[PDB]
Design the sequence.
C-alpha cells in the first residue's frame, strides 16, 4: 500500500495570509513563535503577517536567526527562544531554511530527548506530534510546507542530514504569492528549478504510482508554463509558480526523489551552494543518466514543457526532455557548470561518496555507483 | 483565497487496512467504536479489519445499526453506544451511510450542544474537533472519507440535510479495494456513477479553480476508464475505481457540487432512493441544462471519456459529453427514468422546492429557478 501525508488545511492565492488570524482564533492558540530570517524582517515580508496579528490582538515572539542551509547551532538557538518565549504554536515565514528550522524546533519542543538535533536523522523515532506549525512560504519553492522532511547542516561533520517524520507536518499552509513577489529574479529562477527538480525526480522515482504521477506531471506543466514569466516579473505567473511548487512537493516525502537531490546535498554541505542552483545545474545531466530507466515518462515531460513530441521516437523524446531543461536553465540565467558556482575538482571523490550515501539517492530509477556519480560531477563541472 | 481540507494521512491500495493497527498504536488510542451496518458484519467485511485489530491486541466495540440514508434516530443510537463504550476514537467501515453517521457521532461527542442533530445543518458552528475518525470505505464510492460533509435524513420533516464542518475531517483514510470487491455489480454501477457525478459537478461548479480542476478531470478519466471493467468483476478495474472515487471527492466540499446532488437529495428523503441511482439518472439531464455555462470543460470531459473531440465544434463536444454519460449509464445497467425507481409525478412540485433550497444547488454554474427544476424532473421522469 502507498501512504500520502498532506496538509489537513491549506489556503491558496494572493491574500491567503489574510486567513491566518481566524485560523489561530478557531484553534484557540495563545502565543506564536515566528521563525524567519533577518532579510524577510528587513524587507517588510514578516510585517505582512505581524501587522494582521497585532490588529487581531494575537501575541507573537520572533526568532530571525535562520541562515541558508540551517545548522545544528541555528536549531539549538531557536529552541532556546521557543522555550523561554512560552509560545504554544509556530509560524514559519520564509523558504526551506526557516521552514526546516521550524519543523526541527516544533519536534524537539514536544520530544525534548532530541535536543542534540543529530539523533533526528532518518525516520525520527518521535512519540509526540510537533508543536503545531502554520507554514508561510516566501520562495517558489521547496514545498517545505507540505513535506514531512527537513534538512539540517552538521557543520562539525560537513554533511546535510534529512529528518523524515509524519509528526512534523504543518497543520495549515498559507501559499500566498504576495509573500513571494519580493524574491530577486535570480532567486525566483533557482527556487523555480528546485520545484521543477522535485516534480521531475518525483515523476520518475522508484516508488512512483498513479496519484503522485498525476500531481507531478501537472506540477511540471504549471512550472514550465510560468517560470520564465515569473522571473521577468509577471504577477499572474508568480501565483501559478506558488501553486506549481506546492503540487511538486505533494510527492517528495510520499514517493521520494533521486540522484539530483543526492548530489546537491553534499554541495550545500561543502560550499553552502544555494540548494536551487545546485539542483538546476545537475538536473539535466542526471535526467540523461536516468533516461533508459523512465519508460515513456520523458515524452510526457517533453510535451508539457512545450515540445511537439507527436511523431518523435522514444529516444528523440528523451533527448528533447533533457534539452528543454537545458533551455529553461539558460532562459532564466542559471549558470551551466558547477565550476561557475564555487565547486572544486579536488572535492569530487568526497562529494560522490556523500552523494552515494544520501537517502534521496535510493529513489533514483537507475542504481548509481560511486564511479557513475564521480563521472556525473565531472560532466557537470566544466566545458 | 481558496481553502483545501484533505486527510492529513491516507493509505491507498489492496492491503491498505493492513496499516490501521500501526496507525492506532502510533496515535496512542485506547478503544475504537466501529460504525458499520449488518450487511458488512454478515458478509465478513468488518472481520477483515477486526481480525487484524485482535492480532494486535486492540480494544473495539461495534455499532451496526446504520441504514442507507442514515436518520437522526440512527445517529442517536450510535451516539448512545459511543458514550457508553468509553471509546476514544471511531472507525467508519462502510459506504457513505456509515461514514456520515460516524462524522455526526464524532462531532456531537465533543460538541454536546448539537445532540438534537438537526442543529448541525449548514456550516455547523462547532467549537471542538470531532472525536478522531479512521475511515474505511466499502463502496467506490461517496468519498465521505475525504470530504467535510455528512448528510442525515430528518424523518419527521422528510428532508436530507447536509452538514459542512472542517472539524469532521477523518485523521486517516484507508482506501483498500479488498474491502470493496464484495459490492454487487449493481452497487458498483450506482456508486461508480455517484463518483463520476462528484467529479463532473466538481469540475463545473461556481467555485472551481486550477487545483480542483486538475484533480476532478483526472478522477473523470480514471472512473470512465475503469467503471465498466469493475462492474464486470475485473480486480485491477476495482483498484482504479477505489482511487478514482477518492480523487473525485478531494474537490466536493472544497469547491462544491450543483443541481444533480441538489435534485438527488429530495428523492432520498421522499422515497429512500439509492443516492447513486438518483444521481446517475439525473446527471446527463442536468449536464444538458448546464452546458452553455461550462466554457470548454465538456470538451475535456468528452475527451477523457474516450470521445474523439478533435475537429468537433464546442456545441458538438458538449452534446458528445452528455451522450457519453447516457451510454455509460446504459452499459452498467442503470435504469434511464425516475418512474422506474419509485418516483411519483404528483411529488415533483414538492421535490423541486426542496431541490431549490438544497445546499448543493447554489454551486450549480447555471442559476436554477423552481420552474427550471420542475421541467428537469419531468424530463428525467419518463420518455
Ligand atoms: N523540507 C523539505 O522537504 C525540503 C527541504 N529543503 C531545504 O530548503 C533549503 C532551501 O531553501 P530555499 O527556499 O531554496 O531558500 P532559503 O530559505 O535558504 O533562502 C535563500 C535566501 O533567499 C532569501 N529570501 C527568501 N524569500 C525571500 C523573499 N520573498 N524576498 C527576498 N529574499 C527572500 C532568504 O532570506 C535567504 O537569504 C535547503 O536547506 C534545503 O535543504 C529543500 C527541499 C525540500
Ligand atoms: N460525506 C458526504 O457528505 C457524502 C456522502 N454521501 C451519502 O452517502 C450515502 C450513500 O452511501 P453509499 O456508499 O452509496 O452506500 P451505503 O453506505 O448507503 O450502502 C448501500 C448498501 O450497500 C451495502 N454495501 C456497502 N459496501 C458493500 C460491500 N463491499 N459489499 C456488499 N455490500 C456492501 C451496504 O451494507 C448497504 O446495504 C447517502 O446517504 C449520501 O447522502 C454522498 C455524497 C457525499
Ligand atoms: Fe529541493
Ligand atoms: Fe454523491
Sequence:
Amino acid at each position: 500500500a502507498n501512504r500520502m501525508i498532506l496538509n489537513e488545511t491549506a489556503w491558496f492565492g494572493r491574500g491567503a495570509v489574510g486567513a491566518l488570524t481566524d485560523e489561530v482564533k478557531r484553534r484557540g492558540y495563545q502565543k506564536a513563535l515566528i521563525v524567519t530570517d533577518k532579510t524577510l524582517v528587513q524587507c517588510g515580508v514578516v510585517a505582512k503577517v505581524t501587522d494582521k496579528m497585532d490588529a487581531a490582538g494575537l501575541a507573537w515572539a520572533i526568532y530571525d536567526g535562520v541562515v541558508p542551509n540551517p545548522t545544528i547551532t541555528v536549531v539549538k538557538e531557536g529552541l532556546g527562544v521557543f522555550q523561554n518565549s512560552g509560545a504554544d504554536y509556530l509560524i514559519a515565514i520564509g523558504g526551506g531554511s526557516p521552514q526546516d528550522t521550524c519543523k526541527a524546533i516544533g519536534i524537539i519542543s514536544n520530544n525534548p530527548e532530541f535536543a542534540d538535533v543529530r539523533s533526528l536523522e532518518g525516520l525520527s523515532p518521535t512519540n509526540k506530534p510537533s508543536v503545531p506549525i502554520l507554514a508561510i512560504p516566501t520562495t517558489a519553492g521547496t514545498a517545505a510546507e507540505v513535506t514531512i522532511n527537513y534538512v539540517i547542516t552538521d557543520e562539525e561533520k560537513r554533511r546535510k542530514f534529512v529528518c523524515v517524520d509524519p509528526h512534523d507536518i504543518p497543520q495549515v499552509a498559507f501559499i500566498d504569492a504576495d509573500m513571494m513577489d519580493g524574491m530577486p529574479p535570480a532567486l525566483k529562477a533557482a527556487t523555480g528549478v528546485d520545484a521543477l527538480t522535485h516534480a521531475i525526480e518525483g515523476y520518475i522515482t522508484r516508488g512512483a504510482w498513479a496519484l503522485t504521477d498525476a500531481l507531478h506531471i501537472k506540477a511540471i506543466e504549471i512550472i514550465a508554463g510560468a517560470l520564465r514569466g515569473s522571473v521577468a516579473g509577471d504577477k499572474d505567473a508568480g501565483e501559478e509558480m506558488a501553486l506549481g511548487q506546492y503540487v511538486a512537493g505533494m510527492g517528495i516525502s510520499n514517493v521520494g526523489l533521486g540522484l539530483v537531490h543526492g548530489m546537491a546535498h553534499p554541495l550545500g554541505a561543502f560550499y553552502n551552494t544555494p540548494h536551487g542552483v545546485a539542483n538546476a545545474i545537475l538536473l539535466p545531466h542526471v535526467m540523461r543518466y536516468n533516461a533508459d530507466f523512465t519508460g515513456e515518462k520523458y515524452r510526457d515531460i517533453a510535451r508539457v514543457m512545450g515540445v511537439k513530441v507527436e511523431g518523435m521516437s522514444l529516444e528523440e523524446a528523451r533527448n528533447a526532455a533533457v534539452e528543454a531543461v537545458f533551455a529553461l536553465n539558460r532562459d532564466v540565467g542559471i549558470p551551466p557548470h558547477l565550476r561557475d558556482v564555487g565547486v572544486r575538482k579536488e572535492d569530487i571523490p568526497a562529494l560522490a561518496q556523500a552523494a552515494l550515501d544520501d537517502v534521496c539517492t535510493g529513489g533514483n530509477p537507475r542504481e548509481a555507483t560511486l564511479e557513475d556519480i564521480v563521472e556525473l560531477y565531472h560532466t557537470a563541472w566544466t566545458s
